[PDB]
Write a protein that binds this ligand. Structure first.
Ligand code: TGT
Ligand code: MG
Ligand code: MG
Ligand code: ZN
Lengths: 210, 12, 263, 296, 105, 729, 164, 105, 95
């Protein structure tokens, strides 16, 4: 019954596990489940220690294609400029065209880094965590190995220039200040939802308690 | 409305 | 009407309003009896009226003030029931539990979902009366009042006492709470396993139910006094019994961060 | 929390109210009645919406629904466009200003309350047009649209529980006991009508009209004044509750909590509040008491 | 395992003519390594008294018959002028780590 | 606006002195308008840190200023910007107003500079809040420095460059919470301001002019300047900081020493050698242990306690007054009316406690005697006294005691009696008695430590040096940090610190990696390269080579892709070392930890424990006068709040009684709680709740207004809440 | 005018006190210690008198006043309560009365109840304590029963742990 | 004894106002300093609202529990603790009526 | 988790009922004397400072331990409300 509800055909993600738990709950019974839970807890903990997964700096691997994609998109920006220097593209057109360049370029390096890890280092420390239901956001990874690219202005109009850097290398002084703007807005949203989170629940219990 | 004024006016 | 400091006295604002009414009411009677010039009788009756409003509800028509110090609406009975935060109003913000506790939490890796590590020092105060009696059932103390003084100072506890508490907590369980109690799993019951120190050992799997990291988040702890409250608490409120979330038929005892990475 | 059927006495009301209040912390929060007056800002995302949805409200970019189910016809003139819906019976003119991007085309059918404009819909209108069954179904799915979009996967059940309560009240147009213009609890009318046509004769049909009030109002006005004294105006709620000599039958957890009384939901279930236990030794003991009943 | 400066009452005091504070000294003592030769020596009290413009090292402790100090040149304190330091430092034979709170000598 | 100086440690106070707030006069900016102000506006450049602000509702509003930021004539944070005429950059600087900054084309400091010459055609600049790739011929003005961009408090972070602005905030606020350890060490890697921090703050004592030293007391350094003068420099031996952290000035200069003008004579509370030092550099393995480091928990090696490493001294100031009651003055005497002399020992001085006495919770810090009743004696208490000793001092024991939690050893005491020197004794106040107590705080499981980057966490387990991760040569690791806390958060700077640290360990050297100009990945690999020879060179000569274990982890390391297959283990390990990670053996098993693990010198500080930290556990205690819910204060802890969000949690569960209990027996049921205790006392199952006072208070409040609230029966008939006190007469 | 009534004499008294403090504020630059006030006032004025008078002069405070940071703080949740027996005391009276009640029964009623009732039932009179039997039998049984009662209670130590 | 199953707000009859009440507070006499006791008939009077002490009366004619349900011959005090002092109610008799602002506004 | 909680859940029509039963059984277990049990002999309740759980540690841990067996009977209206407490006092000593 243990084999019937398990998939040994793959690395155990949090989802495979999540599923394992559920199955085990319906199939074998509540307490019997609790046991499997601590069983997993115990070995996971152990094997984790021994595995020797560790954050290092060289572990965050930057793709060799980062330079390419950047440069290719770099010259492409030059065209957009030549095309504006002439009078073809309206003030706006230029802008929305540039952003489009990066938004695509940025997502390009992201599938690049992963492809890098996927093919070359299946066992990178920084990667397994994200693949495993463990820890890591694809967008997050991008900011260390690929690059965090577009930060918005105070109001909401995204900046014209991207943040060329990654966290592995020195996010410079202003690419920083530039990025700083979007930061406040975010933290600002978190403090407001902490309470709004109560706001919403309040209303619902007022009508729904009975 | 407001009390003082009314009595003042009242006896005044 | 209370003695404060040096001789300060504190009184529910309602009393200054009451005096308002009574004085006016009386002055009225005396003004009727003395003889009665119309303007003055009404004038008073007006004041009287207003006054009767004041105790009931202040601010619906003008706002009464204690003399120059605080231009504050003396809380009217209305303000009492309603208020910025008044009667039925704060009746729901919360009240303070008598058998409660609160400390910093820390991961209890070996701990089983079933249990939780509770500081004995904390356990002592929390289960004080349950201990007292237990002391008397053993030779440690002759009686309650004895058992009490026996524990009034920290240096006077015989190691025999711990063995008593450790025996009192045998199969009882407590409730642990987190900062924003968002869902019912925001409070779960565990069996206490008394331990040394200040920190509260929590299980890793339930760290997902309560949104609790270990950078200092402090969890409170409550105690089920009735045999009933205890029955419900360990039967249908114990952590190991509520594994699947009420939101989604998806488990909430999922192997969190480290366990996956390991597995 | 367990995977078997639901167990009688579970505080579902709240269990629900919570499952929807937590994820809410993850939804965006720009402005409640979302967007900003500028050119053409058409929808409302994040929490701002989930507020616009539980509380039945007029979205900024409203979408004119089709009160009539029939066929489509469009016109060309400069200033304002226009979509006409008609059946062999009748046609209805619909004013669609410049900003309105139309979803429908010259040619096919449009069910009652279907989208004729692109964007949000007003529950009230959808209520009137396609029915409660439609508002209800619109609210639920419209709400989940946000959460799904944000990762949260919460069972529809909960939202339903809530929405239902937004429609536990209806309007009156054909009286019997209390005058017509009154908004009262749907099932309470199914109570009147039920006994007025079945047990006591004289069919005095109590004609009503499905009403859709926002979660806030739904609660703001309920049977128990206690519950009402808690939030809106303690001052008014009571005044009325008083004059009328209201008997707050305690059901519901808010009201019965102020009393410090056992909760109506949970173990406080009238279903199990009374249950006794026995040992076969005490079972024969009581029968012996019965046996003793034989006189002489 | 224990120390007694004669004019000092609590551990957080500072002695005149003595650069180091009680806490730094009791700390340097922990650095002191002694060696007795037989079981008969369970608890040995080492004694030392030095005055004036001298540097107090561990070799300055009066010798004890069956006890040897492997840490002579260790630095206990720096005495200026009118520097009066007379202490009695206990020494024991035990195992592991024992917080000063645990034994309370 | 004016507040308690926050001097947990010098740097802290320094910040609290320069911080800028929104809220205030009421005229400027109140609590309502926020989101446009709270955000980091464009002009906040060099004028205000974009990181330094407080996490929490009050965010962005309150914030300390930047590095070079200076208020010129009228409060306009001008930021410095050096002039660049043509393709020439100047060493001249203009403190420009926010407004004027926009009229020019400004460029960043990162621009390749030959001196006065800009070096690249397409080099970045930013017109007005807009990033713009400008030409060297348009570059009118350039940024002054990377440092001017942020605050002092932030400038102290090693590789700020690699850490997400979000968690670097945590790092900057964490330092403000650093507590002075008796053993203060500077980071193995610093930014460059540690010196200036301690110097500009007033921690260490610096030498005015050149001379020689005369006397070097533990209480004074009388130096002799060459001018023919000598001055005595007292040293705040052990002073109480507002938040209870020790402030001691330990002398670092020996007798008869020629001092340079402005050199450390003594070190401040937290300085090692004129450098800022909070917490201590500790070797650290960065791997997962059992669960001891699960979400954000830290495993620590007992070995760190053996050495007085994380240990800090604390002082709390207990105070009691002898009040004048109309019943009779409250006397402060050694006399404690009812039971023993054993408790009177440390009460040596008649009344006050003896300096240097170890006071545990529940010992008399000071005695005092007030009178028994309000106005009348006691009929029942009259008989008892008479029975065993009528002649009994009727005076009450109202004596300052050691509050639960802890006390140390009394180090100072103050008593102000009748004939006041030049003091202000409040009215009614006969006399005051202060008691300063100090206590050594050794690191323990409840404590929380955190590096400058933001990795915050608590100790979950103190392991025996016996079995924690040990290196090939017997040196064990002090602290084992979980990796999982690194990806989500984005601060590789810590992982960059640990690497440089590894080299500093074997190379026995500390470094200074500036804010964004500092150390570079190749330079570090270069020092690690040097370290491999100190690590493994000695290993060669000392006599041995490589383990079965060492080779074994290599096998698994090449199958991984860390080492170039085919090279010699010696050569491979170098590679593997350069990567910042080395082989580690379990310690418990002695086997290796499959896969190289990184390790190294990471600076880590310990954070101050707030009064809340004192875990509050309450059995029974006081109760509010108007509201009858549990209240604490002095010695009784006070109950925890059971809020709505928590009610529902129970509501949701079938927790019926457990919730009634929380609303009756535990907080408001007056008659309930009483019979409750008693019941427990006799081992009787707690009684079934009586009506809560909340309810009764309501009904009457409601009766206070015309309304009549009457409870009812099965059949609509009365029932009674107010047990028997409402029927008349 | 006041919450706590004050006769006309106290009033003018307070006015005079006030007026005096005014003339005293005139030159010292020092808000008079209650020494000046006594002097300047007149015949029988002393420190104790002035400190007392100004103590009654202060009007009460609003048990309900905006407290701490003025947000939502009502001055009354912080004051504790005294009559009410905190659990600790309810437990006291239980054992105390159950144990006192056990002793009271195992003794001869004659002089034990006399002193039990005279001391514990009405008010605190050796002679007036016993019915017909004079003082000699009072002191006789009082001191002989009280000691037999205390010395066996010394044996089975129940009372020694001073319930107070 | 019976479970409270339904609560009901209803208007106050002037006769019910008096039914709940005890005595009439006829004078603005809070408490008079010299003796922190209730002044005359005023707001705090003991007849009107009750005894201010555990089981004892004000003067003390009866002082324990045996007679818990009776009142004092010369002065009026029926006792259980001071809770009766906090649950009882008195009423003021208005000269010429006035109205509840809760209903008028 | 706890012993056969599933088995228990199954023996009741409603989850919240099982809690009521156990709790009301634990009550009587203590009140009428703690020996009011149905399964004491061979394999019974046990704690380890000695094997002394046999006397009075946790009430309901017993109740559950008994209910798990098929000796008890819980109904909606099984035995008349006041005649029960009488018959129980009569047969179980220990006070
Ligand atoms: C998607 C993912 O990888 O999960 C993260 C982690 N559960 C955790 O991250 P931390 O800040 O502790 O580093 C966090 C939490 O504490 O609840 C806060 S951030 C988070 O909202 C996000 N979307 O990145 C999300 O929740
Ligand atoms: Mg946290
Ligand atoms: Mg976290
Ligand atoms: Zn009397």
């Amino acid at each position: 019954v243990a084999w019937e509800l398990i998939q040994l055909d793959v690395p155990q993600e949090k989802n495979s596990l999540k599923d394992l738990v559920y199955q085990a709950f319906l199939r074998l019974g509540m307490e019997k489940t609790a046991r499997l839970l601590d069983a997993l807890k115990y070995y996971g903990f152990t094997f984790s220690t021994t595995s020797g997964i560790t954050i290092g700096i060289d572990d965050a691997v930057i793709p060799e294609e980062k330079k390419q994609y950047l440069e290719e998109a770099d010259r492409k920006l030059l065209q957009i400029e030549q095309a504006y220097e002439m009078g073809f593209l309206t003030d706006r057109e230029r802008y929305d065209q540039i952003l489009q360049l990066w938004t695509e370029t940025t997502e390009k390096v992201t599938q690049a880094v992963f492809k890098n890890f996927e093919e070359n280092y299946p066992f990178n420390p920084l990667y397994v965590m994200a693949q495993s239901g463990a820890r890591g956001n694809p967008q997050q990874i991008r900011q260390l190995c690929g690059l965090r690219g577009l930060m918005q202005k105070p109001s909401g109009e995204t900046f014209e220039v991207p943040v060329r850097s990654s966290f592995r290398e020195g996010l410079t002084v202003l690419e920083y200040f530039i990025s700083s703007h979007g930061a406040r807005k975010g933290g600002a949203d978190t403090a407001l939802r902490t309470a709004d989170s109560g706001y919403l629940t309040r209303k619902l219990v007022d009508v729904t308690h009975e | 409305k407001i009390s003082t004024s009314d009595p003042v006016r009242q006896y005044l | 009407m209370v003695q404060v400091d040096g001789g300060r006295f504190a009184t529910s604002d309602l009393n200054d309003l009451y005096r308002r009414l009574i004085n006016r009411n009386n002055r009225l009677k005396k003004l009727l009896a003395q003889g009665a010039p119309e303007i003055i009788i009404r004038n008073e009756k007006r004041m009287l009226q207003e006054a009767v409003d004041a105790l009931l509800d202040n601010g619906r028509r003008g706002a009464p003030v204690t003399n120059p110090g605080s231009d504050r609406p003396l809380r009217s009975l209305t303000d009492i029931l309603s208020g910025k935060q008044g009667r039925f109003r704060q009746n729901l913000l919360g009240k303070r539990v008598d058998y409660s506790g609160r400390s910093v939490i820390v991961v209890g890796p070996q701990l089983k979902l079933h249990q939780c590590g509770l500081p004995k020092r904390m356990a002592l105060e929390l289960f004080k009366p349950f201990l007292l009696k237990k002391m008397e059932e053993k030779g440690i103390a002759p009686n309650v009042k004895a058992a009490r003084r026996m524990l009034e100072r920290q240096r006077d506890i015989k190691d025999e006492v711990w063995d008593a508490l450790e025996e009192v907590i045998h199969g009882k369980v407590v409730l642990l709470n987190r900062a924003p109690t968002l869902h019912r799993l925001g409070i779960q019951a565990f069996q206490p396993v008394l331990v040394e120190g200040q920190s509260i050992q929590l299980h890793p799997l339930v760290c997902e139910a309560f949104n609790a990291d270990f950078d200092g988040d402090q969890m409170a702890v409550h105690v089920p006094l009735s045999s009933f409250a205890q029955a419900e608490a360990r039967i249908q409120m114990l952590s190991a019994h509520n594994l699947l979330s009420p939101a989604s038929g998806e488990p909430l005892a999922k192997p969190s961060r480290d366990i996956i990475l390991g597995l | 929390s367990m995977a078997r059927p639901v167990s009688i006495g579970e505080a579902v009301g709240i269990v629900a109210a919570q499952s929807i209040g937590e994820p809410g912390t993850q939804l965006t929060m720009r402005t409640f009645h979302t967007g900003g007056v500028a050119g053409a800002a058409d929808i409302t995302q994040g929490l701002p919406r989930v507020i616009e949805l539980f509380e039945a409200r007029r979205p900024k970019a409203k979408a004119v629904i089709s009160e009539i189910d029939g066929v489509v016809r469009i016109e060309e003139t400069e200033e304002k466009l226009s979509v006409f819906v008609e059946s062999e019976g009748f046609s209805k003119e619909y004013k669609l200003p410049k900003e309105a991007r139309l979803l429908v085309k010259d040619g096919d059918y449009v069910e009652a309350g279907q989208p004729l404009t692109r964007g949000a819909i007003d529950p009230h209108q959808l209520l009137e047009a396609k029915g409660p069954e439609a508002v209800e179904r619109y609210l639920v799915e419209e709400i989940q649209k946000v959460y799904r979009a944000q990762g949260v996967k919460l069972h529809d059940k909960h939202i339903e529980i809530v929405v239902r309560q937004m429609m536990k009240y209806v309007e009156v147009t054909d009286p019997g006991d209390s005058r017509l213009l009154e908004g009262q609890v749907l099932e309470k009318w199914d109570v009147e009508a039920l006994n007025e046509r079945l047990i006591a004769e004289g069919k005095t049909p109590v004609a009503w009209k499905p009403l859709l009030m926002g979660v806030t109002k739904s609660a703001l006005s309920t049977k128990s004044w206690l519950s009402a004294a808690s939030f809106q105006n303690t001052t008014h709620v009571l005044t009325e509750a008083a004059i009328a000599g209201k008997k707050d039958e305690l059901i519901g957890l808010k009201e019965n909590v102020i009393l410090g009384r056992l909760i109506p939901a949970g173990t406080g279930s009238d279903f199990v509040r009374f249950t006794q236990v026995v040992d076969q030794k005490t079972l024969k003991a009581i029968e012996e008491a019965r046996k003793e009943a034989v006189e002489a | 395992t224990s120390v007694y400066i004669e004019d000092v009452l609590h551990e957080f005091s500072t002695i005149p003519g003595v650069k180091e504070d009680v806490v730094e000294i009791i700390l340097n003592l922990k650095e002191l390594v002694v060696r007795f030769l037989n079981p008969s020596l369970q608890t040995v009290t080492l004694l030392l008294k030095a005055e004036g413009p001298k540097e107090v090292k561990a070799r300055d402790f009066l010798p004890v018959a069956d006890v040897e100090i492997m840490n002579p040149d260790l630095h206990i304190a720096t005495l200026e002028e009118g520097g009066r330091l007379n202490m009695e430092v206990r020494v024991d034979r035990g195992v592991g780590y024992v917080p000063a709170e645990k034994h309370g000598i | 606006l004016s507040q308690f100086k926050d001097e947990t440690n010098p740097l802290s106070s320094l910040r609290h002195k320069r911080r800028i707030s929104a809220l205030g006069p009421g005229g400027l900016t109140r609590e309502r308008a926020g989101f446009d102000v709270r955000d980091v506006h464009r002009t906040h450049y060099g004028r205000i840190c974009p990181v330094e602000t407080p996490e929490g509702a009050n965010i962005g509003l309150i914030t300390s200023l930047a590095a070079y930021a200076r208020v010129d004539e009228l409060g306009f944070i001008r930021t410095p910007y050096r002039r660049v005429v043509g393709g020439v950059v100047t060493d001249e600087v203009v403190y420009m107003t926010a407004t004027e900054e926009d009229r020019y084309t400004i460029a960043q400091a990162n621009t390749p500079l030959e001196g006065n010459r800009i070096a690249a055609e397409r080099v970045v600049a930013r017109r007005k809040g807009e990033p713009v790739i400008v030409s060297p011929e348009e570059v009118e003005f350039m940024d002054v420095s990377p440092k001017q961009v942020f605050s002092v408090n932030t400038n102290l972070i090693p590789f700020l460059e690699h850490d997400d602005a979000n968690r670097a905030l945590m790092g900057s606020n964490m330092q403000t919470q650093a507590v002075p350890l008796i053993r203060a060490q500077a980071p193995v890697v610093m930014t460059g301001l540690e010196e200036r921090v301690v110097r500009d703050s007033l921690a260490a004592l610096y030498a005015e002019e050149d001379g020689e030293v005369a006397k070097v007391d533990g209480n004074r350094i009388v130096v002799r300047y060459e001018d023919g003068r000598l001055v005595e420099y007292p040293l705040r031996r052990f002073y109480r900081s507002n938040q209870g952290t020790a402030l001691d000035q330990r002398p670092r200069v020996v007798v008869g020493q020629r001092v340079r003008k402005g050199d450390l004579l003594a070190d401040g509370p937290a300085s090692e050698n004129g450098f800022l030092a909070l917490g201590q550099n500790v070797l650290v393995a960065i791997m997962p242990f059992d669960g001891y480091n699960f979400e954000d928990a830290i495993v620590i090696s007992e070995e760190l306690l053996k050495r007085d490493f994380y240990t800090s001294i604390h002082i709390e100031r207990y105070e009691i007054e002898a009040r004048d009651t109309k019943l009779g003055p409250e006397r402060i005497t050694r006399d404690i009316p009812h039971l023993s002399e054993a408790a009177l020992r440390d009460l040596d001085e008649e009344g006050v406690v003896r300096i240097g006495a170890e006071v545990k919770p529940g010992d008399i810090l000071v005695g005092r005697t007030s009178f028994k009743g309000e106005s009348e004696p006691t009929p029942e208490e009259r008989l008892l006294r008479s029975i065993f000793g009528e002649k009994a001092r009727d005076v009450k024991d109202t004596s300052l005691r050691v509050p639960p939690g802890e006390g140390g050893i009394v180090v100072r005491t103050v008593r102000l009696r009748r004939g006041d020197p030049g003091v202000e004794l409040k009215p009614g106040v006969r006399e005051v008695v202060r008691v300063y107590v100090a206590q050594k705080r050794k690191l323990q499981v409840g404590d929380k430590l955190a590096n400058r980057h933001g990795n915050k966490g608590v100790v979950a387990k103190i392991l025996p040096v016996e079995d924690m991760p040990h290196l090939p040569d017997g040196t064990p690791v002090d602290v084992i940090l979980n990796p999982l806390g690194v990806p989500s958060r984005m601060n590789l700077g810590q992982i960059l610190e640990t690497h440089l640290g590894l080299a500093g360990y074997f190379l026995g050297q500390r470094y200074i990696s500036p804010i964004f100009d500092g150390a570079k990945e190749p330079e570090i690999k270069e020092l690690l390269a040097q370290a491999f020879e100190v690590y493994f060179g000695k290993r060669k000569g000392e006599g041995f080579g490589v383990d079965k274990r060492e080779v074994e982890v290599l096998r698994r390391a090449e199958k991984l892709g860390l080492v170039t297959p085919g090279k010699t283990p010696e050569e491979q390990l170098k590679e593997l070392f350069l990567q910042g990670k080395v082989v580690l053996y379990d310690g418990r098993t002695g086997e290796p930890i499959e896969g190289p693990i990184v390790v190294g010198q990471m600076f880590i500080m310990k954070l101050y424990h707030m009064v809340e930290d004192k875990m509050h556990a309450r059995s029974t205690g006081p109760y509010s006068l108007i509201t009858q819910q549990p209240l604490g204060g002095k010695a009784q802890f006070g109950g925890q709040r059971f809020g709505e969000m928590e009610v529902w949690a129970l509501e949701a569960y079938g927790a019926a009684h457990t919730l009634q209990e929380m609303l009756t027996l535990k907080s408001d049921d007056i008659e309930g709680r009483n019979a409750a205790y008693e019941a427990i006392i006799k081992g009787e199952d707690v009684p079934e709740p009586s009506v809560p006072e909340s309810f009764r208070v309501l009904v009457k409040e409601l009766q206070a207004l015309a309304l009549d609230v009457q409870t009812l029966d099965e059949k609509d008939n009365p029932v009674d809440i107010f047990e028997g006190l409402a029927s008349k007469r | 005018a006041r919450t706590i009534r004050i006769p006309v004499h106290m009033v003018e008294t307070i006015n005079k006190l006030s007026r005096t403090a005014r003339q005293l504020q005139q030159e010292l630059g020092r808000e008079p210690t209650y020494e000046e006030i006594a002097e300047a006032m007149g015949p029988g004025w002393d420190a104790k008198r002035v400190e007392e008078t100004l103590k009654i002069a202060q009007e009460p405070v609003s048990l309900e006043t905006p407290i701490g940071d003025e947000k939502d703080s009502f001055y009354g949740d912080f004051i504790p309560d005294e009559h009410l027996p905190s659990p600790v005391d309810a437990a006291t009276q239980s054992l105390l009365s159950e144990e006192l009640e056990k002793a009271l029964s195992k003794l001869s009623e004659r002089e034990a109840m006399v002193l039990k009732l005279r001391k514990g039932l009405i008010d605190g009179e050796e002679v007036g304590a016993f019915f017909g039997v004079t003082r000699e039998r009072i002191r006789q049984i009082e001191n002989k029963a009280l000691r037999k009662l205390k010395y066996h209670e010394s044996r089975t130590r129940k009372l020694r742990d001073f319930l107070d | 004894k019976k479970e409270v199953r339904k609560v009901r707000i209803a208007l106050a009859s002037p006769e019910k106002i008096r039914s709940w009440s005890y005595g009439e507070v006829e004078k603005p006499e809070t408490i008079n300093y010299r003796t922190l006791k209730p002044e005359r008939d005023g707001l705090f009077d003991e007849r009107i609202f009750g005894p201010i002490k555990d089981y004892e009366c004000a003067c003390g004619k009866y002082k324990r529990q045996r007679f818990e349900g009776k009142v004092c011959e010369r002065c009026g005090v029926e006792v259980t603790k001071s809770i009766v002092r906090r649950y009882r109610m008195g009423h003021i008799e208005l000269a010429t009526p006035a109205a509840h602002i809760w209903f008028v506004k | 988790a706890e012993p056969g909680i599933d088995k228990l859940f199954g023996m009741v029509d409603s989850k919240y009922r099982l809690t009521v039963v156990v709790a009301k059984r634990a009550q009587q277990l203590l009140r009428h004397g703690f020996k009011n049990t149905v399964l004491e002999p061979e394999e019974r309740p046990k704690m380890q400072t000695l094997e002394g759980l046999f006397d009075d540690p946790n009430a309901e841990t017993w109740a559950m331990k008994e209910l798990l067996t098929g000796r008890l009977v819980f109904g909606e209206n099984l035995v008349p409300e006041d005649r029960l407490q009488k018959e129980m006092e009569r047969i179980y000593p220990g006070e």
